[PDB]
């Protein structure tokens, strides 16, 4: 009786939200950006090839200096690369080799990683002893660790396969805030540029917008038909793009609280592993299972170019803070740095 | 045309590669086994016989180092992290023979043996393990023999029309799992009957792993 009545009220609230979103859908993003000229064909060459990983690479993250990057592979090695020279700055042996994510601290003093061991390990890069050591192991998730992102040297947000995201205080090693509400495995998260909000995509085909300080879900974004594997904030923080296993990328708006554009092609029938934006946000770069990285026009949903330089699934990619280059990691154990030429 | 600091920076990188290449050779000569099974199916017993989120166990037998990964604690979707084990030497699958007349505690309608068959079918026919051999263990042999005297095997398999003896009932169950093999060309299944007091469980794995090593060597050398 009471349970039946309550679940009927949830359907009414969902219908109310759907009608509200449809009410403000006066125009389409395609119509708005029809007049602007296309970006043309985007041709990028492999400037650098980072060799040394001997197994599948699962994650990479640029440092804020746009020169150093950290990559994680399931050969049990975290490697820090000097992208300008391809020199290896550090090689961090992982206690657990089943790593799925890695993060570079914005200060550059720390890196983080974690996988099927359900632990987010923090590594100090600037020690008086001259070696990288584990400074913290963040335990508490009951599923695999899918993504992690530093807010600063003391705070990091992790998403897990136990359907929850958490905000951690690194100094005390405890999660100050727990973000619950996903009914499936959360596969990725992206921090807003001001680091006051973050979005997460899960395997329930939904994306939730979370308030970091308050600790509750502000908005929920649906529309995908399968698990969301990748998510990335727009450079101004008012939008984000997701990549799912249904071979589609969608651009959701925070303020309009609904999807604006879908980025898919008929030839593409494989899942999407990673997504990122260019510095201006005009280009959306997405990694795919078909060994390729497709460059999309974010505004016009046109495939601007293709990065085809890997012999296995492109598992991760990232764009520098200055927008100078894009790195792609892949299951073929190589990382490649791409940029165009005049 | 590099400065004195950059020359040491490049020299440092070569020092790192000498250690990464060294570890790659060591990690390629060790055996990585993925351990699967059902609840109370003897999967935990095998670890005790061959002594967070994932439990990893190491043991060396006859100059061969084995890495056995137990993923019983992962309650999330299997399909997300299953590809992380693409490339394991072999898969050890534990099935409880005695759990043929029992049912799942939660489902209360699905037979416990049929649950193992569905799990085996999802792993044997999995795309990531197309050419991965399976070392199928059928544990609880003694308990299965006692229960088959009172409880007929027809309850689990209605199509079974054989003698009510272990020598014929167990062989029928073994063929049922092997019949689930959707690719009888690229892989073989090594079926073994263990027990709570057996001591040849590790020996079977070593011989089964050796045949997998030989098969990979033949593929590399071009004979196969």
């Amino acid at each position, epitope marked *: 009786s009471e349970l039946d009545q309550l679940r009927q009220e949830a359907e009414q609230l969902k219908n109310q939200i759907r009608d509200a979103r449809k009410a403000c859908a006066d125009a389409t993003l395609s119509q708005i950006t029809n007049n602007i000229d296309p970006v043309g064909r985007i041709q990028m060459r492999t400037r650098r090839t980072l060799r040394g990983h001997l197994a599948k690479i699962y994650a990479m993250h640029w440092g804020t200096d746009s020169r150093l990057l950290v990559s994680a592979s399931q050969d049990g090695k975290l490697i820090i690369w*000097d992208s300008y*020279t391809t020199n290896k*700055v550090h090689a961090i042996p992982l206690r657990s080799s089943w790593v799925m994510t890695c993060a570079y601290a914005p200060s550059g003093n720390y890196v983080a990683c974690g996988g099927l061991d359900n632990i987010c390990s923090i590594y100090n890069l*600037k020690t*008086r002893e*001259g070696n990288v050591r584990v400074s913290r192991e963040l335990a508490g998730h009951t599923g695999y660790l899918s993504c992690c992102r530093f807010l600063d040297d003391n705070q990091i947000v992790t998403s897990s396969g136990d359907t929850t995201c958490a905000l951690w205080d690194i100094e005390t090693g405890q999660q100050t805030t727990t973000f619950t509400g996903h009914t499936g495995d959360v596969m990725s998260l992206s921090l807003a540029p001001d680091t006051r909000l973050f979005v997460s995509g899960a395997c329930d085909a939904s994306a939730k917008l979370w308030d970091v300080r308050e600790g509750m879900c502000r908005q929920t974004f649906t529309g995908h038909e399968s698990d969301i594997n990748a998510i990335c904030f727009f450079p101004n923080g008012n939008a984000f793009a997701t990549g799912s296993d249904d071979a589609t990328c969608r651009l959701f708006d925070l303020r309009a609280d609904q999807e604006l554009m879908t980025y898919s092609h008929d030839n593409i029938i494989c899942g999407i592993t990673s997504v990122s934006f260019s510095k201006s946000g005009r280009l959306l770069l997405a990694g795919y299972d078909d060994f390729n990285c497709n460059v999309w026009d974010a505004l016009k949903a046109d495939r601007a170019g293709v990065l085809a330089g890997h012999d296995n699934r492109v598992s991760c990619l990232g764009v520098t803070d200055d927008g100078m280059a894009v790195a792609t990691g892949s299951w073929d154990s190589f990382l490649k740095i791409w940029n165009g030429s005049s | 045309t590099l400065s004195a*600091e950059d020359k040491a*920076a490049v*020299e*440092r990188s070569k020092m790192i590669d000498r250690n990464l290449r060294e570890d790659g050779e060591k990690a390629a000569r060790e055996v990585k086994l993925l351990l699967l099974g059902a609840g109370e199916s003897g999967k935990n017993t095998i670890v005790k016989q061959m002594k967070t989120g994932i439990v990893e166990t190491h043991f060396t037998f006859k100059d061969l180092h084995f890495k056995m990964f137990d993923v019983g604690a992962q309650r999330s979707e299997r399909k997300k992290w299953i590809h992380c084990f693409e490339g394991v030497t072999a898969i050890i699958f534990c099935v409880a023979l005695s759990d043929y007349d029992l049912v799942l505690a939660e489902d209360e309608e699905m037979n416990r043996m049929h649950a193992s068959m569905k799990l085996f079918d999802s792993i044997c026919n999995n795309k990531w393990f197309t050419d991965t051999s399976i070392i199928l263990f059928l544990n609880k042999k003694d308990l299965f023999e006692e229960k088959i005297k009172k409880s007929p095997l027809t309850i689990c398999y209605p199509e079974y029309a054989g003698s009510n003896t272990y020598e014929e009932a167990a062989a029928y169950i073994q063929c049922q799992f092997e019949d689930l093999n959707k690719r009888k060309d690229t892989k073989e299944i090594y079926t073994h009957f263990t027990c709570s007091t057996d001591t040849k469980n590790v020996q079977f794995v070593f011989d089964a792993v050796t045949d997998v090593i030989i098969k990979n060597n033949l593929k590399d050398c071009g004979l196969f």
Partner: single-chain antibody, 231 residues
Framework: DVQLVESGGGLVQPGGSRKLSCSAS????????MHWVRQAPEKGLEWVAY????????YYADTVKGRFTISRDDPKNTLFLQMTSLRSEDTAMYYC??????????????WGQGTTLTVSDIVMTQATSSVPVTPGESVSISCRSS???????????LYWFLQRPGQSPQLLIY???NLASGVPDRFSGSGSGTAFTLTISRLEAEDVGVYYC?????????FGAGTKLEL
């Protein structure tokens, strides 16, 4: 804690041989390149030798090449300097210096206490030998180089060290602008091309000492004469 203890120094006869050891504790010795730097009495700093991490690269100063041998024992974390045919010119305090080289590292950051030995090329110039100073006042120290220390990669390989009376040298500024870890922010390094300035805002009692500018563009590493601050 990070420690570097040198031993083996003492009074030796001319033409003799002596073996200097530098034992390292509290840090990953095998990850750091190691230098020996000496300072003649009432003179400036003088670089002696360098051995890289992994012992693959070895450099010597011209004045000692062929007579001195530098070696390391990574399992024992000991640095060695085998000396032969010792001359009266070799009378100096020999310092053990660690330096690690990767992008963003701070070479020459830690120096040993030194051992005393008594026997019975880019030019770095610090013309101003002494500067009378008062606490709380801003001081600038000038250094000059015969060659431009700015490399084509954007780095300017100039280092600043402070040797307080009775103490080992300490790194202040590495690559002409960066401030070493544990150094107060009042120190600032400014330069261009061949002319460099070290600015010390709000001078304190601890800052009193001799200041050396070193070039790291190429070997041999050469030091300036040094500028002393006195009250």
């Amino acid at each position: 804690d990070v420690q570097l203890v040198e031993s083996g120094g003492g009074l030796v006869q001319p033409g003799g041989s002596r073996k200097l050891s530098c034992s390292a504790s509290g840090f990953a010795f095998s990850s750091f390149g190691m230098h020996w730097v000496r300072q003649a009495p009432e003179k400036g700093l003088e670089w002696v030798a360098y051995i890289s991490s992994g012992s693959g690269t070895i450099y010597y100063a011209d004045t000692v090449k062929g007579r001195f041998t530098i070696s390391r024992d990574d399992p024992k974390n000991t640095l060695f300097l085998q000396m032969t045919s010792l001359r009266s010119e070799d009378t100096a305090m020999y310092y053990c210096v660690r330096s690690i080289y990767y992008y963003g590292s701070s070479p020459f950051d830690f120096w040993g206490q030194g051992t005393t030995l008594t026997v019975s090329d880019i030019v770095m110039t610090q013309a101003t030998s002494s500067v009378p100073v008062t606490p709380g006042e801003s001081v600038s120290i000038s250094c000059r180089s015969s060659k431009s220390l700015l490399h084509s990669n954007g780095n300017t390989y100039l280092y600043w060290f402070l040797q307080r009376p009775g103490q080992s040298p300490q790194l202040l500024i590495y690559r002409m602008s960066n401030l070493a870890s544990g150094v107060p922010d009042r120190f600032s390094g400014s330069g261009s091309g061949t002319a460099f300035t070290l600015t010390i805002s709000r001078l304190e009692a601890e800052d009193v000492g001799v200041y050396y500018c070193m070039q790291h563009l190429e070997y041999p590493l050469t030091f300036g004469a040094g500028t002393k601050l006195e009250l």
